[PDB]
Curated annotation (Swiss-Prot):
Source species of the chain: Saccharomyces cerevisiae (strain ATCC 204508 / S288c) (Baker's yeast)
Gene Ontology molecular-function annotations: DNA binding; DNA-directed RNA polymerase activity
Record-level GO cellular component terms: nucleolus; nucleus; RNA polymerase I complex
Region (Interaction with DNA): 138-219
Keyword Transferase: yes
Function: DNA-dependent RNA polymerases catalyze the transcription of DNA into RNA using the four ribonucleoside triphosphates as substrates. Component of RNA polymerase I (Pol I) which synthesizes ribosomal RNA precursors. Besides, RNA polymerase I has intrinsic RNA cleavage activity. The heterodimer formed by RPA34 and RPA49 stimulates transcript elongation by Pol I. Subunit RPA49 can bind both single-stranded and double-stranded DNA.
Residues of the full protein shown: 185 to 403 of 415
Location(s) in or outside the cell: Nucleus, Nucleolus
Reported impact of S174A: Loss of DNA binding
Presence of keyword Disulfide bond: no
Family, similarity comment: Belongs to the eukaryotic RPA49/POLR1E RNA polymerase subunit family.
This protein's name: DNA-directed RNA polymerase I subunit RPA49
Gene Ontology terms describing biological process: nucleolar large rRNA transcription by RNA polymerase I; regulation of cell size; ribosome biogenesis; RNA polymerase I preinitiation complex assembly; termination of RNA polymerase I transcription; transcription by RNA polymerase I; transcription elongation by RNA polymerase I; transcription initiation at RNA polymerase I promoter
Amino acid sequence: DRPTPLANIDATDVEQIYPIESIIPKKELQFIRVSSILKEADKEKKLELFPYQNNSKYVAKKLDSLTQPSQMTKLQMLYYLSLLLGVYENRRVNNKTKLLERLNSPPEILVDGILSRFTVIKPGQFGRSKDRSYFIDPQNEDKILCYILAIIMHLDNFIVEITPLAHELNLKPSKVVSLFRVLGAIVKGATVAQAEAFGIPKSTAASYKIATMKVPFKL
């Protein structure tokens, strides 16, 4: 286990640096069925199909633009991001049965995969007979956050504003910057064009941090 998904250093397109299969293993990915989300026309009903619901509008914002079958991969990633956010916000929960009680019936295999790869399992044969026990330490928190940020990069077309994201995740902007750099993303001041697109003053562009990914990926 490393803090980031496995990067494809030889990617020729930014979407291939952290492909969907590096974020969600193929065996687990086949269980993320999103056809029902695409077919649902009512926004409120579409949202109810997700594995976690909270008081945030974040997943709801990303969802509005995902209406066509060509966007299936991005929708699978958004579904998984919802689940990772659910695990992250409920990180104090220390057992599988108790975790499922906070979620909206995600396929069990996805939860098992998350506990196996993003937590410190509480080992023991007596405990294992009762349920899967674990805790999420600071290194695990960084790993969940790096997988979340890797998905956000796909959903934001590889141009991410630091400040609004930090507010959403309840993190210091410096922490979001640090995690993007662990992912090999480039974090620097907004270019003139980026400032115009994000609706921020042109004079403040250099101080407004943006995370980007570009091919060829860093070595």
